[PDB]
Swiss-Prot record, chain A:
Result of knocking out the encoding gene: Decreased sensitivity to dramatic intracellular increases of ppGpp. Cells missing mazE-mazF survive high temperature, various DNA-damaging agents and H(2)O(2) exposure better than wild-type cells. Cells missing mazE-mazF produce more P1 phage than wild-type cells, while introduction of lysogens into a growing non-lysogenic disruption culture is lethal. Cells missing mazE-mazF show reduced biofilm formation, and survive antibiotic treatment in log phase better than wild-type cells. However lag phase cells disrupted only for mazF had a lower survival rate than wild-type cells.
Domain remarks in the Swiss-Prot or TrEMBL record: Loop 1 (residues 17-28) effects catalytic activity while recognition of the ACA cleavage site is influenced by loop 2 (residues 53-61). Alterations of loop 2 generate new cleavage sites in addition to retaining the original cleavage site.
Name assigned to this protein: Endoribonuclease toxin MazF
Protein activity control: (Microbial infection) RNA cleavage activity is reduced when ADP-ribosylated. Inhibited by Mg(2+). Stimulated in vitro in a concentration-dependent fashion by EDF, which is able to overcome inhibition by cognate antitoxin MazE. The TA system is antagonized by stress response kinase SrkA, but probably not by phosphorylation of MazF.
Functional note: Toxic component of a type II toxin-antitoxin (TA) system. A sequence-specific endoribonuclease it inhibits protein synthesis by cleaving mRNA and inducing bacterial stasis. It is stable, single-strand specific with mRNA cleavage independent of the ribosome, although translation enhances cleavage for some mRNAs. Cleavage occurs at the 5'-end of ACA sequences, yielding a 2',3'-cyclic phosphate and a free 5'-OH, although cleavage can also occur on the 3'-end of the first A.
Species in which this protein is naturally found: Escherichia coli (strain K12)
Biotech exploitation of the protein: Can be used to produce large quantities of a single protein if the gene coding for the protein does not contain any ACA codons. Up to 90% of expressed bacterial cellular protein can be the target, which can be produced for up to 4 days. The system also works in eukaryotic cells.
Gene that this polypeptide is encoded by: mazF
UniProt record, GO biological process: defense response to virus; mRNA catabolic process; negative regulation of cell growth; positive regulation of programmed cell death; quorum sensing; regulation of DNA-templated transcription; regulation of growth; regulation of translation
An example Gene Ontology CC term for this record: protein-containing complex
Swiss-Prot record, chain B:
Superkingdom assignment: Bacteria
Cellular component annotations (GO), alphabetically ordered: protein-containing complex; toxin-antitoxin complex
Protein name: Endoribonuclease toxin MazF
One annotated GO molecular function: protein homodimerization activity
Gene: mazF
Length: 111, 108
């Protein structure tokens, strides 16, 4: 394994399989929401899966400064065990984009 | 055909699940609206549990058949239609509200 731990606003490579359906699946990038201490202690995390297919859905947020231009899904929120699923740091995301994700999550469940 | 609405408590099979993530059949709280759930066939729910460890993010659910606790730390976007999520009841407004609060504190 490794000593790596996910932090808020990070970008990780994780496998979301198995999946029932219409739940972003397979290996892919995910933006980490939950803070470093929750991630560390609980060994779990909150994250939004990323995709290279932009269909123009409302909760889609565009991520720049990456290896392949794509979108993160803000309404797709995922609770996972990262230490168990072997999350790996893929990089970082700009504060504004993380902010738009978080902003959309309170819009989805704020109602 | 039934669709999950905000505040609804539903019965759903979370399997398969890996790690410390909640698995098996159990209730859950829909934090997503009716229209979204109806469109995407998806939804955001917090899985409940009968075992309260006194964890910081535990929100006590009162008034159900069993006395459990909903976990706000785990917010899962699942396909309720695909898993055949069934309505078990409703959570009191203040419960859904406390849940929203805790979740949004873990985020925001």
């Amino acid at each position: 394994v490794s000593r790596y731990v996910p932090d808020m606003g990070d970008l990780i490579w994780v496998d979301f399989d198995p999946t029932k359906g219409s739940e972003q699946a397979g290996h892919r990038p995910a933006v980490v929401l939950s803070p470093f201490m929750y991630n560390n202690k609980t060994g779990m995390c909150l994250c939004v899966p990323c995709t290279t297919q932009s269909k123009g859905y409302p909760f889609e947020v565009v991520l720049s400064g990456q290896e392949r231009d794509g979108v993160a899904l803000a309404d797709q929120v995922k609770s996972i065990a990262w230490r168990a699923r072997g999350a790996t740091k893929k990089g970082t995301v700009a504060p504004e984009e993380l902010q738009l994700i978080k902003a959309k999550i309170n819009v989805l469940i704020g109602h």
